[PDB]
DNA sequence: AGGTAGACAAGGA
DNA sequence: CCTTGTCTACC
């Protein structure tokens, strides 16, 4: 899922949720339990905490308990759902946290590349995979400033840049191509090569992309057809390591 | 150390 | 062979 779907999962999953207390914690694949080490011990202290709330950062879903805060990354193909504990799993449950509702709050994944992390509430801020982390890109605090800042100070192009998750929260590929045909910026164009009118068009049509989304691409996969906006071929090629898909006569 | 590229996750085609 | 974010590893 990307921020926006994150977003929504956030808003939908809470009411689900919130309230309940956990009576059991079941692992099926331990890989995904990340922090603490030992997934019987990830098991072990969240027996008996209730659920508070739920808040996002970035692509993150932070479950909020009574003492603890379990991080979330569901990547790929990670999903939740919540379910009675009398009917049987779907394929691919990895994690199940059992409410004493007899309800079952459960972790589906069948790439398994999702992670969970449990810390003290007051220190999952300050710990991976959540410390470090950007701004999130619909608040203040995400500025043309700051985007400038950043950029000066890098030989890196402007894709790698606003692909690095310490610049802002949770703009994956998709967003970023988005984001970049719509300031008419070429994605491998070096970030300290922007203009301030760039970076300030830039910083705006990220905050619009993001925005849209949360409340039909351009780019993003569709090379080859025509331009939405000129009917030039959209083309794609590799910037930062990746699949990258712009147009040639908008962007430059 | 400090900036930044890519190793790593792992199953489905 | 391929998929993708990101946080650890590298120079
Ligand atoms: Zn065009």
Not at 27 to 34: D, G, H, L, S, T
Not at 138 to 144: E, I, M
Not at 205 to 210: G, K, L, Q, S, Y
Request: net charge positive; proline share 7%.
């Amino acid at each position: 899922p990307e921020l926006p779907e994150v977003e929504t999962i956030r808003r939908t999953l809470l009411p689900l949720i919130v309230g309940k207390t956990i009576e059991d914690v079941r692992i099926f694949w331990p890989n995904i339990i990340r922090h603490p080490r030992d997934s019987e011990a990830f098991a072990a202290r969240m027996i008996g905490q209730t659920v508070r709330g739920l808040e996002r950062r970035g692509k993150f879903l932070k479950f909020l308990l009574d003492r603890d805060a379990l991080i979330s990354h569901l990547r790929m193909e990670g999903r939740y759902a919540v379910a009675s504990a009398l009917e049987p799993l779907e394929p691919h449950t990895h994690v199940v946290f059992c409410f004493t509702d007899g309800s079952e709050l459960r972790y589906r994944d069948v790439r398994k590349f999702g992670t969970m992390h449990v810390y003290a509430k007051e220190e999952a801020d300050r710990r991976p995979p959540l410390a470090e982390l950007g701004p999130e890109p619909l608040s203040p605090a995400f500025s043309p400033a700051v985007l400038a800042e950043r950029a000066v100070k890098t030989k890196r192009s402007v894709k790698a840049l606003l692909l690095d998750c310490t610049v802002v929260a949770g703009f994956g590929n998709i967003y970023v191509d988005e984001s970049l045909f719509r300031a008419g910026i070429l994605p491998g164009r070096p970030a300290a090569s922007l203009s301030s009118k760039e970076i300030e068009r830039l910083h705006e049509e990220m905050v619009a992309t993001i925005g849209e989304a949360v409340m039909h691409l351009y780019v993003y996969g569709r090379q080859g057809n025509p331009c939405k906006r000129c009917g030039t071929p959209i083309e794609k090629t590799v910037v930062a390591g990746r699949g990258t898909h712009y147009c040639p006569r908008c962007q430059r």
